[PDB]
Structures are given as C-alpha cells and as structure tokens.
Design a protein around this ligand. Structure first.
Ligand SMILES: Nc1ncnc2c1ncn2[C@@H]1O[C@H](COP(=O)(O)OP(=O)(O)OP(O)(O)=S)[C@@H](O)[C@H]1O
Ligand SMILES: Nc1ncnc2c1ncn2[C@@H]1O[C@H](COP(=O)(O)OP(=O)(O)OP(O)(O)=S)[C@@H](O)[C@H]1O
Ligand SMILES: [Mg+2]
Ligand SMILES: [Mg+2]
Ligand SMILES: [Zn+2]
Ligand SMILES: [Zn+2]
Lengths: 623, 657
DNA sequence: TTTTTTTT
C-alpha cells in the first residue's frame, strides 16, 4: 500500500476519498455544511462544484486550483483528509495535486475532448488550499505548530526580488563529457561519486555545470502581524514568508492579505565554514495560497439599480460614514475623492491624473480624526499617519540597503492617504509633500540615489486653524495659515466650525446617546459600496461634455474675475469627472460641474464667507 | 588524571528518596498522592509541565525525620547542584510514570504513531527526552517558613544582579529586578532524528550544546549490515522540539549602589514558562544559575573565563476569584465604598477629597465603546491638575502611579516627546532603524503621570494630542510606517503661568493651554491655595501627626490596603454597564444648557472655553465609571448628576474665590 | 562621505 510515514494516513485511501471529492462533490455539500438552507440554489448547489471548476480550468488551461477548507469538511470522504492536511500538509498537498492531475487526464479522456493529454501531463497541476484554519495571531505560534498549515493575516512590509531557487542539478564528466542531472532532493545534491557511464566511471570527474543546471524562482516577503492580533504589550512582529512559483511577485508593499501556508523551520549554520548548526532554528512559512484583503451579473445589476436610485449621491455620502452625524457635504467630498477623477494619460504634455485632494482644517473635537480613520478603513490601499509621528524621509522615501525604502505616500500610490494633524506636520515635510502631490510622483536626488517614483495617490489632510478654534476675526486664510502654494495644491477645504446651534447640538447629542444605549450599535453594505466604487473606477470613464466645458470656462472666468488658480479649474474639472463616475457616467454633464462649484463654495463656506476682509460670518455659517 | 573525590552524596540513595517522596507525598496537611495525581494528568496529557515544590520536599523531609530516617536532605541538596537533580527527578517521574487514563491525546501524535511502529520494526534504544513530554520545574522555597533558618542564609532572598557571585553557579537562586528586554520565542531541539532510506533506521541524535554538527552518516545497523554508507536526512517531524525565549533582567535603581551602573543578567526560558514574562515589569525569578560555554575558537580566546546565564524554574510577579469575591463583598457590605476608597487614596494627603474621588474615577476608567459601523470612542479618562506650586500635586501623582498596577511616572523636561510616545533607534544592530516603545507605550492599559506638563514642550504636547484623544500611535518615521494600539490613561500636573494663578488673569489665560488640548482632557482641576487660619491649622495638625506617627491620623476613617483597592478596581472595571433613556434626556438637557452658557459666557472673568462634544463624551465616561464603582449594570441619573457636580466644583473652585 | 533619528 501507500501510507504517509508517521501518520497512518493511507495515500491510496486519501487519493480515493479526494477523487470522490473532486467528482461527485456537489456544491450542495458545501452549502449544507454552511447550512444557509434558505440560500441554496439548485444549479450551484446541485452542480459538482469541483467538476465545473476543472472543466473551466481546462478551458483556461491553468494548473492551479484554489480550495477552501469548507469543501473538504463537507465531503465525508475528504472530511478526514481535511484534518490529515492540517496535520501533515506537504504530503497531503502532493498527493492531492497528483490526484487533480489524474482527474483532469480522466476528464479529457473520458469526455473524449480534443485536448493535448501531453499538456495536462505536462501541466504541473497544483491545489491552493485556503481557509485551512481559523486565523491565529502569528506571535501565538509555537514550535509544535511546525509542519502544519497556518492561516495568517497581515500587511506586506516588503518583498525581495525573485531569487534563483535551485531546482535540478546538472553534472558533466570531465574526461568523457558524459552528463547527468541530479534532482535537488531536500534542498541538497548527492553528486555521483563516479561517472554514470560505467565505461568511464571516472571518480570526481562529474562536475556541476551551474548554467546547464535547472533553477526555480523564489521570493520572500516580510508580512506584518495585524494590530488586531497583537497585544498592547509589544510592537507587531513580521515574518519573511518564502513565496514560490507564480505566487512570486504576486503582491506589492502595503498589501493587507490573508495567506495560508505550511509552518516551516530550518537550522542555521553557527559557523559558515563548519557544518555546526545553532541549536535554535530559523522559521519561515511557505504560502500555498494567498488571499487579497469578479463583479457578478447580479452584482452589476445591484450596482446599476442603486445607480438608478436618485439618492445615490447622498445615500453613498451617508453610507461611507454611517455613524457620523451630519457633515453630508464633507462626506460627499470624500466620497468623490474615493471615486477619483479620470486619468487621461496624454501621450504628450505628461499624464493628467484625475486625483482629488481634500484637507480638513477647522476647530477640533469635530470628528475630523474619526473621519480620517473611516477613510483609511474604507480605501483598500490606505495609509494612516500623523505629522508629529511622521518624517519626510519616511513619508516618501528612505535610504537603506544601497537601497530605498518606500514611504507612506509610496504605500498609497494608487490609493488614498491619510495625514492626521497635518497642520502640526513640519513645514519642511510640507514642502516635501508639495511637489510629490503636485506631480503625483516622488523625485529622488541623492548621492548615488537619483531617480523618480510613481506617487499617484489621494491625500486626506486634517489640520486645525492657527487659532485652536477658528477665529472669524482672523481671515479664513489667516485662520488656516498654510502656504498659499500648498493651499492651492489641495482641491477641497472644508472649514468645519462648532457653531453653537441648540437644535443641532440636541440632535447630535441624541445621536451619540442612542449609540451609547446599544452596547454594540439607510446605508449601503460597505462591501457592496466598495464594489460599486471599484466597478465605477475601472469600467466607467467620465469624459468632458460640450455644455460641461462651456460652463467650466464661464465658472472659472467668474472665479478669477472675483484667487482662482488654474489648479482651481483642474480641480472643478476632476471633481465633475468624479461626480459623473459616481453617477456611473462615461460622459460628463453640466450638472456635474454645477455640483462641483456648489461643493467648492460649500467647503470654503463661500455662502457665509465675507466678500471682503477674507473672513467668514459665523452667524451666516450654518445660518 | 580525573582523580576521584569523595563527597557526602549518593545519587542512588537520593533517587530512591525522590521516588519515595513522589509516590508517597500528598498535600494531606493542606487537604492519591498529589504528585502521582499530576503524573496521572500528564499520562492524560492534561499537563506538559511539572513543578516540584521545594517546600513540599521540606515537608516530606520533616515527616521522614519525625518518623526517623537517614534523610538525604534533598530540599537543601537541590540548591547546591540543581541541574543533575532535575534530571534525576525527571528519570524518577518516568519510572513512577502512571499509565494513561481516560482518553489519551495521541490522536495524531507522530511520535506515539511511529515510535511503536519503529519498535514493531525492531521487534536506551532512543533518548528518554524524546518520549518525555513534560517540562520539569521547581518552585522556590517559601521564605515565610524559613524553617532552614541557619540553613536559610538568604536562599529565598532575591539578590540583585551584582549580588550574584560565581559561587552561586550551579545553584538555584532568586533575583528581583525589571525585565529590560525580551526576545521573540524560537524553537529548539532536545533531540534530533535523522532518517536514511538505505537503513530505514531513524537515528536519534541528542543535543544539549548551544550548537551541534550533523552526523551526515549512518551508524545504524541496517546500513552497516549491508555495508552501505547512509546519507542521513534531518526529520523535523521526528526530531523533538521545544520553545525557547531569552529575557534580560536589570538591577533596580534602589538595588544599584550609588555611583554604580546597573548590571543585567541574561535569562533563558524554555517550555511552558516561555512568554510568561513581560518587558519592563518588576518580577522575582527563581532558577538554576549556570555558566554559558563558548564556541571552540571563542572558547580558546576566552579560556577559563566563562559567560553565565540563568534558567528560570519559576517566576513571581509583584503585581498582575472566589477568595477575591469574598474579599470584595466585605467592602461592598461595608458600604459607601466610593467615598471610602476616595479617602483611602493618598492617606498621607489631607483634604482635596473631591480630587481623590475624581482620581478614583479615572483609575476605574470609562467604558471603551466600539460601534457596529466601526466607530470606537476612547473610554479612557484624562484629567489635568492646574494649581499653585507646593500643593502636593506631584505627591498625588506619584501616589497614583504606585497605586495603579501598570502606572508609570514621568516629567516633561526629563522625557522627550519622541521618547514619551515612541523612539526610532537608528542603530540597535546593523544600523537598522527600530521603533522603541515610549513612556506611553509602557503605560499601555495603564496610567502615565506627567509633571510640569506646562513646562513640557508645546510640540511634544501636540504629539501627545494624538494619543490622548485617539488611543493608537501612528508612526511614519524613516523606514518605519507603523501603528501602535497604545491604549492608556493620562494624568497631567501643571501650574498657572507665572507659577501661580492670577485672579486678574482669565482662567484660560492662567491655564495657558491650547483649546484643542484643553478640550481633549475630560477634566481640569483648578485647585488653588489661599491662606485659611482654620484650614491651615487642620492641615498642619494632620501633617504633624503624619511626621510624629508614620500612619496618618485615623480621624475616625479606615483606609483600605493597596492590594485591596487594586483587586476591587479590577472587579469594578469588569462591569461595563449600559445607560438608560431617562439619563439620555437628562444629559442632553444638561449639555444643551452648558453649551448655551458658554455661548453667552465668553466673558474673560468667567470664560473657561467653549463646550464641545468631547465634554459630553467625558461626562458619559465619568457616569459610566461611577456606575462601575457602584457596580450597577446600568448608569443611573445619580451618577450623571454626580459627574456634573464634579465638573461644576472644578470650575467653581475659582469662582468661589 | 552620505544619509539619518535622535539628543545635546
Ligand atoms: N458631526 C459629528 N458626528 C459625530 N461625532 C462627532 C461629530 N463632531 C464631532 N464628533 C465627535 O467629537 C470627537 C472629536 O474627535 P476628533 O476626530 O479628534 O475631532 P476632530 O474634528 O478631528 O478635531 P481634532 O482632531 O481634535 S483637531 C469624536 O468623539 C467625534 O465622534
Ligand atoms: N494637603 C496636603 N497634604 C499633605 N501634604 C501636603 C499637602 N499639601 C502640600 N503638602 C506637602 O507640601 C509639598 C507640596 O509640594 P510637592 O508635593 O513636592 O509638589 P507640589 O508643588 O505640591 O505639586 P507640583 O506643583 O505638581 S510639583 C509636599 O512636600 C507635600 O507633601
Ligand atoms: Mg480628531
Ligand atoms: Mg508636586
Ligand atoms: Zn565519464
Ligand atoms: Zn541509513
């Protein structure tokens, strides 16, 4: 028979059970295991999930099979195999991959489909199991956990460039030239003492020809343990997980990803010259599967239905920060920034990103920081930090080993960034931020390190007026006291004020008190909301409109006529673009421009802003 | 040439005595044998660590001597050469090891699965530690009995690092000190098993050194039987493994002689005891003190000089059930526990009972709340004390810091803002920037005391703004973009500009603080010192009694002990009450009234700053804390009015003039 | 030398 050493896990019985789990495994098994009998759909449930996946996989011709734990736990034959994998992954996964390969071969031959059986025989079919176990704190790991799949969550601190992973050794005789290939067993080579040709059998003439030898691809990624898992006692740990094969270079830095992989430990040479190994063992993990943090026709239908709703604008605005009371205009602005404008990358004149930049300067206690926390949570690529705890070097780029470290902005490139207490943040680091946001790119100029980097990301700044409470006596510009260039760089500026409105105070107190009532206290499903925003960004592409352009011209002429920098024009342009995107419009409209101007005036409180003196009438503010 | 030396010890006799003790000894005086019961749990795989209490050994020795025996004085014996005796105890445990009971845990244990298989193929063969799954340990002798007396010269007495002397090498000892740093846990092998296909034999190399060299060849018979030369392969599954961690304990400043730098000892921990320690926490540790051998070349370089380390048998913490429950119902039945505790706070200090009450409320802390939408509002409470110099403010803060189990004391000038929050050390090793937990990090789930907070730098003041309102600490310094939970409570001490308050100056001007800062505090106390002949006499009498008698004059008051307050405070903090709607209406009306007052009360003479939602949240936190003290499941309107009274008193102290 | 938090 075929059994796994030290486990009493019969490889033959394992193969038979996993085969029956491959064909004759209805998704009904999974759903019933998950109960949800009110959500069972015959087609999906009665479908042999894995057989359909294998058919679509042959159609795609890929050799990788993502696999959840629940499917194994649903099939009685493979329910035991689930625990077998949990205990002794490597062997189980190897047997399982072989079984998948054989099942594909059977499917092509059984279905007599015109397919290259050699290709499938050549296709190294693999299984990428996921959900193997409940996500456990990495710090919680202990030695006995070694040799087991450990579902893990974390943030990608950094990743190494791919490394040649020696695969099969190739030798050659130095007297008769006869060659032989030694496969790397257990990461070691057993060189032939004498020539494989007994005719020659020359001792030590067999030499390893590095170039002729076979190598694989390996990469390693540092993954930070999430703050949820770690305790207050100490800083989060990180593990340099070793990735291999296609999984290599399958994630950038700052990627909130959940990964399942076997827990691995190895010796380490105490003295490189000698074979003496330190008693303690280096520990790593081999990710068999990676989870990052397709819009189904049903999902698209829901998206378009919500788009049909007129409240879409205000509905999303409230949905992004459901707990926040009021502040609908600020919510709408940040919602637009989440949507972002259109990135018309002109072949000439450079690229023109449709980015949106919103600063929040106003009297404190206004939840601005809480709003920043929300924004960071929402954006899939979020970067939260505070100026005081932030450094310009660490913000954008940090020299290292000679090598460079990505800064906070770099970790936001293609995402949203949050800089709390932006006013407190140093003026020098402010100047650093100026050009990078202006060009959406980091320019580096240092001894031996001189280059530029992509920094296309939105920033959500939170500031406080020079006077702790915004002083209407001081002009708005004086109240903020920020560089006029920097001021222009930002697209929107909400001047939140704590006007003493007994009615509004009553209502906000009601909100907060009600929250207090429920120990654990409409709005879109944040997941569905994110899907909406994504689909809009990727598929929808707003384009300027004739009426829109005419109105923009007239509006900016008025602005400059009343200062209206050209960046103001680009700001309203990108804002109308993001509005159309919010409306799932690939074409801009006059109404988008009108909304852009309206919100521009709102955030600056232009309605209450004094026509002269640069001040704002607090009585006019919120009337 | 290795001359034999007679010594008054017979390991065979001592082993026999050990076996007799284990099988025989039971905690009958306290009450099968308790040690046999533990071994039975081990057979059940219920426990993987065994603690043999030297006090139990002493009790057994007393029983034998009273019976009359050639006692081997094991309890004393273990102290001189602990490690060999630990090995002997482990062997005895194996000898007296009971069979499994109920259901054994070898459902998938590869050892049990294959060890028998290996035997069936075969049908000490393998190292005893390979099969052994129980971590032996020794509890230190209780100093309360000190029955050794003349023998108990200082055995239990914890000794500073410098107090340690090479003579103590190879001997169990006790040390009190703070844990400077703790390494991350790492695995280590007691036994290494190689597998070679040619033999099919799984050899079992056992390693006790810091490092080892691989066998790389088969002495296994099967390869020898065929004359084949085996290519041994490491088998992690087969090889035994144990968790290891390293901790460094440093001398206490009190222990440190004047003009002498503190000394620190490296500590090795293995098995279950790993991770028991926590950095920066005072702890008393007992364990075998052993030399650390070198690598061959570094050994030749060092020669007879040897590194030394400590292997901790047991750990005792000076600070962190039913007994607790009865202890607390005692005070609960006593009643008025709130005011009783407030008075019990700072027994030295006289008066300011309202301040003590507010400090107690801060100690319990407000309920931390998280919303389904994902909102989380800081339940911690922050109070500022702004008063004329020499009014015992610093003394009060130090008293609180001592009172709270996790409290940390700090001064603005002595602490850097970066160090206060977190520091990025460029070169710990290899010039790699590393974040360092600041004083606040040390204060996590604890109270941080900041003196001369007015003298504190304004920039660092803004730095702490983030942490105090928002628990987490976000750091984007060079090479480190990270966030720290950093949940802690803040108490700040400062004095009015120009030293003391000026009635001519407005309260805000005398405060001289950013409005954002001011609001972020839940409470500010404007305690002021005015000459009052009668009050001065009373305070002087109290202080004079305190000097004459160290205990403060009883004044018909009874003060609960620190351990008791900490216990009751933990229990109360466990409550987490939920408030009611009538309270909502009351608090909403009060907040509206206060906001209207501020909206009309901008006058410098009576201007204390505009009311803010943070004020309402602080009021709610104070009410919840009051409920915690009263232990009610829900906040009561009484608590709300009490918190309002506290705030009103804080503000009116000046208005009283 | 160059870059770099951090304290002095
Ligand atoms: N409109 C609002 N809705 C809900 N909560 C609010 C609102 N305005 C203020 N708050 C609360 O007021 C508190 C202020 O928190 P912050 O986020 O620090 O305020 P802020 O606007 O960021 O001003 P800072 O940070 O002090 S400069 C939080 O507890 C918020 O929940
Ligand atoms: N009510 C009191 N009860 C007991 N001792 C008191 C009292 N008021 C003052 N003292 C003593 O008088 C001195 C007051 O100064 P300190 O306690 O050293 O610092 P403090 O100035 O009171 O507080 P600061 O301003 O934050 S340093 C201390 O020696 C106190 O012990
Ligand atoms: Mg805030
Ligand atoms: Mg003082
Ligand atoms: Zn040859
Ligand atoms: Zn062999």
């Amino acid at each position: 028979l075929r059994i796994i050493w030290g486990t009493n896990v019969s490889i033959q019985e394992c193969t038979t059970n996993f085969r029956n789990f491959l064909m004759s495994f209805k998704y009904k098994f999974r759903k019933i295991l998950d109960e949800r009998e009110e959500f069972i759909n015959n087609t999906t449930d009665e479908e042999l999930y894995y057989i359909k996946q294998l058919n679509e996989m042959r159609e795609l011709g890929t050799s990788n099979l993502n696999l959840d734990a629940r499917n194994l736990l649903a099939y009685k034959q493979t329910e035991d195999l689930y625990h077998q994998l949990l205990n002794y992954p490597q062997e189980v996964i190897s047997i399982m991959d072989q079984t998948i390969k054989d099942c594909m071969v059977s499917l092509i031959v059984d279905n007599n489909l015109d397919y290259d059986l050699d290709e499938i025989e050549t296709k190294f079919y693999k299984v990428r199991p996921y959900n193997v176990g409940s996500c456990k704190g990495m710090r919680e790991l202990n030695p006995n956990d070694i040799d087991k799949l450990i579902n893990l969550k974390g943030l990608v601190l950094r990743s190494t460039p791919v490394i040649p992973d020696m695969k099969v050794a190739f030798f050659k005789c130095n007297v008769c030239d006869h060659t032989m290939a030694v496969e790397i067993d257990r990461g070691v080579i057993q060189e032939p003492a004498r020539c494989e040709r007994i005719d020659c059998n020359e001792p030590n003439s067999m030499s390893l020809i590095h170039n002729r030898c076979s190598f694989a691809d390996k990469q390693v990624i540092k993954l930070q343990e999430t703050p949820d898992f770690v305790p207050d006692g100490q800083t989060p740990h990180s593990i340099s997980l070793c990735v291999y094969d296609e999984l290599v270079d399958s994630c950038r830095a700052g990627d909130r990803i959940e990964v399942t992989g076997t827990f691995r430990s190895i010796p380490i040479r105490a003295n490189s010259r000698q074979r003496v190994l330190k008693s303690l063992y280096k520990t790593y993990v081999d990710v068999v599967h990676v989870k990052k943090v397709q819009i189904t026709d049903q999902d698209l239908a829901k998206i378009r239905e919500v788009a049909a709703r007129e409240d879409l604008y205000s509905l999303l605005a409230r949905s992004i920060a459901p707990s926040i009371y009021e502040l609908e205009d600020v919510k709408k602005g940040i919602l637009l920034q989440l949507f972002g404008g259109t990135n018309k990358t002109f072949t000439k004149g450079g690229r023109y990103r449709g980015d949106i930049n919103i600063l929040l300067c106003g009297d404190p206690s206004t939840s601005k920081s809480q709003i920043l926390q929300y924004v960071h949570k929402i954006t899939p690529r979020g970067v939260y930090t505070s100026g005081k705890g932030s450094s310009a070097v660490g913000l954008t780029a940090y020299i290292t080993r000679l090598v460079l470290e990505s800064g906070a902005l770099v970790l936001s490139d293609g995402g949203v960034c949050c800089i709390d207490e932006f006013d407190k943040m140093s003026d020098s680091t402010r100047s650093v931020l100026h050009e990078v946001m202006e060009q959406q790119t980091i320019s580096i100029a240092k001894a031996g390190i001189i280059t530029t980097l992509n920094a296309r990301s939105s920033i959500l700044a939170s500031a406080n007026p020079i006077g702790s409470r915004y002083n209407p006596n001081l002009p708005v510009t004086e109240n903020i006291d920020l560089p006029p260039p920097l001021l222009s760089r930002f697209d929107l500026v909400y001047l939140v004020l704590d006007k003493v409105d007994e009615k509004n105070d009553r209502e906000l107190a009601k909100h907060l008190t009600n929250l207090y009532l429920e120990d654990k206290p409409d709005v879109l499903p944040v997941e569905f909301l994110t899907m909406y925003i994504s689909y809009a960004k990727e598929h929808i592409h707003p384009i300027i409109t004739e009426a829109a352009k005419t109105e923009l011209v007239r509006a900016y002429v008025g602005m400059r006529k009343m200062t209206a920098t050209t960046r103001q024009l680009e700001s309203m342009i990108r804002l109308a673009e993001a509005h159309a995107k919010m409306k799932l419009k690939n074409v801009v409209e006059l109404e988008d421009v009108q909304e852009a101007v309206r919100l521009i005036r709102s955030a600056i409180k232009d309605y209450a802003t004094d026509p002269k003196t640069g001040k704002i009438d607090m009585n006019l503010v919120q009337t | 040439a290795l001359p034999s030396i007679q010594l008054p010890v017979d390991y065979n006799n001592l082993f026999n005595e050990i076996t007799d003790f284990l099988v025989t000894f039971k905690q009958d005086t306290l009450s099968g044998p308790k040690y046999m019961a533990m071994l039975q749990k081990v057979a059940n795989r219920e426990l993987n660590s065994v603690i043999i209490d030297l006090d139990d050994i002493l009790q057994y020795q007393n029983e034998k001597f009273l019976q009359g025996t050639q006692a081997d004085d094991l309890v004393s014996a273990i102290q001189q050469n602990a490690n060999h005796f630990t090995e002997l105890f482990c062997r005895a445990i194996d000898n007296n090891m009971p069979l499994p009971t109920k259901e054994i845990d070898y459902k998938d244990d590869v050892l049990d699965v294959i060890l028998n298989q290996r035997r069936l193929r075969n049908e000490e063969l393998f190292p005893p530690n390979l099969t052994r799954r129980y971590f032996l340990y020794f509890k230190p002798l209780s100093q309360n009995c000190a029955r050794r007396y003349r023998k108990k010269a200082i055995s239990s007495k914890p000794l500073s690092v410098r107090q340690i002397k090479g003579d103590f090498l190879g001997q169990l000892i006790t040390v009190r000190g703070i844990i400077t740093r703790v390494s991350d846990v790492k695995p280590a092998v007691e036994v290494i098993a190689y597998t070679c296909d040619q033999c099919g034999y799984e050899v079992f190399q056992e390693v006790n050194s810091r490092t080892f060299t691989p066998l790389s060849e088969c002495t296994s018979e099967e390869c020898s039987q065929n004359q084949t030369k085996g290519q041994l392969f490491m088998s992690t599954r087969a090889s035994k493994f144990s968790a290891f961690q390293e901790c460094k304990i440093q001398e206490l400043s009190q222990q440190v002689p004047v003009g002498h730098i503190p000394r620190s000892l490296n500590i090795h921990v293995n098995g279950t005891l790993v991770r028991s320690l926590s950095p920066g926490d005072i702890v008393d540790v007992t364990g075998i003190f052993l030399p650390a051998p070198y690598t061959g070349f570094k050994a030749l370089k060092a020669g007879l000089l040897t590194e030394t380390y400590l292997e901790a048998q047991f750990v005792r913490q000076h600070k962190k059930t039913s007994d607790v429950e009865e202890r607390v119902m005692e005070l609960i039945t006593s009643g008025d526990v709130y005011n009783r505790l407030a008075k019990s706070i700072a027994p030295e200090i006289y008066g300011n009972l309202d301040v003590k009450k507010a400090l107690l409320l801060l100690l319990v802390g407000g309920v931390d709340k998280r919303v389904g939408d994902g909102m989380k509002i800081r339940g911690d409470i922050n109070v500022c004390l702004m008063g004329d110099p020499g009014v015992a403010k610093s003394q009060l803060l130090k008293a609180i810091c001592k009172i709270s189990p996790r409290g940390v004391y700090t001064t603005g000038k002595g602490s850097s803002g970066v160090g206060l929050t977190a520091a990025v050390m460029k070169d710990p090793v290899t010039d790699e920037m590393i974040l360092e937990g600041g004083a606040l990090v040390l204060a996590d789930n604890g109270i941080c005391c900041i003196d001369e907070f007015d003298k504190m730098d304004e920039s660092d003041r803004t730095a702490i703004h983030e942490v105090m309102e928002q628990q987490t600490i976000s750091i984007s310094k060079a090479g480190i973009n990270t966030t720290l939970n950093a949940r802690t409570s803040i108490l700040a001490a400062a004095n009015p500009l120009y030293g003391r308050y000026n009635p001519r100056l407005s309260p805000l001007d005398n405060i001289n603080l950013p409005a954002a800062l001011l609001s972020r505090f839940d409470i500010l106390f404007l305690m002021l010192d005015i000459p009052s002949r009668d009050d001065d006499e009373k305070l002087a009498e109290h202080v004079t009694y305190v000097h004459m008698h160290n205990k403060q004059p009883d004044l018909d008051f009874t003060p609960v002990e620190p351990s008791k307050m900490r216990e009751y405070i933990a229990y109360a903090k466990t409550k987490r009450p939920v408030m009611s709607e009538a309270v909502n209406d009351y608090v909403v009306q009060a907040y509206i009234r206060l906001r209207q007052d501020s909206k009309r009360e901008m006058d410098s003479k009576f201007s204390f700053g505009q009311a803010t939602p943070r004020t309402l949240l602080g009021i709610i936190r104070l009410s919840q804390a009051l409920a915690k003290l009263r232990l009610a499941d829900m906040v009561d309107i009484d608590d709300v009015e009490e918190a309002l009274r506290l705030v009103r008193v804080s503000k009116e102290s000046l208005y009283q003039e």
